């Protein structure tokens, strides 16, 4: 039993809700919140920009030190950093950004990072400003993640479409 509330159950381990991941994380304070990161951990917009804003830019400061030490992530890769005031940890995961021409096949590799954590609050990878089809992202999530994932979809219209079209 966990403290996530109001989710629709899609499979044994995947749940979905219309919610602002920022407000969800603040309410639940999960062990792991997933960020929709880019390889430079520049949290300018989308989910990343919103999560960073909620940390008063502390996420960006920590991320800049991470990059200065380690260099950029790989597309499909991840790193674990602090969750600041939002969660214990933030798993920064880089899905492919279609608006950069990146290979959509890497979306499965991106979701594989979730399997290293027993429970996660997450957005749909490569959705929104990363330009992938959210219906496809949900399918890859369900077919790749085996740990317990609580998906937050900010857009109510998109949420209803994701639920109604789910196979
Ligand atoms: O896929 C992730 C995208 C989905 C999206 C957003 C808007 C319009 C269309 N798609 N973004 C988010 N998801 C959950 N919480 C969020 N908080 C801020 C941004 C955000
Ligand atoms: Cl977005």
Determine the Cα–Cα distance for residues 145 and 104; give it in Å rounded to an integer.
Answer: 17
Hey, how many other C-beta atoms are within 10 angstroms of the C-beta on 87?
Answer: 23
C-beta of residue 21 within 8 angstroms of C-beta of residue 121:
yes
Task: Give the contacts of 43 (CB within 8 A, at least 6 positions apart).
Answer: 35, 37, 49, 51, 52, 59, 60, 63
First to last CA, the chain: 26
Short-list 85, 151, 83, CA closest to 114: 151
CATH topology of domain 8-163: 3.40.220
Kindly give the pairing relationship between strand 78-82 and strand 89-93. antiparallel
Determine the Cα–Cα distance for residues 53 and 129; give it in Å rounded to an integer.
Answer: 17
Which residue has the least CA distance to atom 19 on ligand 1?
Answer: 47
Please state the φ and ψ torsions of residue 16, each to the nearest 5 degrees.
-145, 145
| Alpha helix stretches (DSSP H) within the chain | 21-28, 46-54, 58-70, 106-112, 134-144, 156-164
**What technique determined this structure?**
X-ray
Q: Which residues line ligand 1 (CB under 6 A)?
A: 20-22, 36, 46-47, 50, 123-124, 127-128, 152-155, 158
Determine the Cα–Cα distance for residues 36 and 66; give it in Å rounded to an integer.
Answer: 16
| Proximal ligand: closest to the CA of 154 | 1
- What residue ranges do the domains of the chain occupy? 8-163
Determine the Cα–Cα distance for residues 1 and 34; give it in Å rounded to an integer.
Answer: 20
Give the pair of three-digit tokens for residue 86.
Answer: 């939002």
- Helix, strand, coil % (nearest 5) of the chain? 40, 20, 40
Whole-number Å distance, alpha carbon 129 to ligand 2 midpoint, is: 5
Whole-number Å distance, alpha carbon 147 to ligand 1 midpoint, is: 22
Output the 3-class SS for 19-31.
CCHHHHHHHHCCC
Short-list 20, 45, 31, CA closest to 151: 20
What angle (nearest 5°) sits at the alpha carbon of residue 111, between those of residues 5 and 1?
25
C-beta of residue 122 within 8 angstroms of C-beta of residue 151:
yes
Q: Which atom of ligand 1 sits closest to the CA of residue 129?
A: 3
Whole-number Å distance, alpha carbon 19 to ligand 1 midpoint, is: 9
The residues that bridge with 149 in the sheet, in sequence order, are 14, 120
Q: Which atom of ligand 1 sits closest to the CA of residue 22?
A: 17
Instruction: Please identify which residue in the block is written with the tokens 């609050």.
Output: 121
């Amino acid at each position: 039993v966990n403290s996530f509330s109001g989710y629709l159950k899609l499979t044994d381990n995947v749940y979905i809700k219309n919610a602002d991941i920022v407000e969800e994380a603040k309410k639940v304070k999960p062990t792991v919140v997933v960020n929709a990161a880019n390889v430079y951990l520049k949290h300018g917009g989308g989910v990343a920009g919103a999560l960073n804003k909620a940390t008063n830019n502390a996420m960006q400061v920590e991320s800049d030190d991470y990059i200065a030490t380690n260099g950029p992530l790989k597309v499909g890769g991840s790193c674990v950093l602090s969750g600041h005031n939002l969660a214990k940890h933030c798993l920064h995961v880089v899905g492919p950004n279609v608006n950069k021409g990146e290979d959509i096949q890497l979306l499965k590799s991106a979701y594989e990072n979730f399997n290293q954590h027993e429970v996660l609050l997450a957005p749909l990878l490569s959705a929104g400003i990363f330009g992938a089809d959210p219906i496809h992202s949900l399918r890859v999530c369900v077919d790749t993640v085996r740990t317990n994932v609580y998906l937050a979809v900010f857009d109510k219209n998109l949420y209803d479409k994701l639920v109604s079209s789910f196979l």
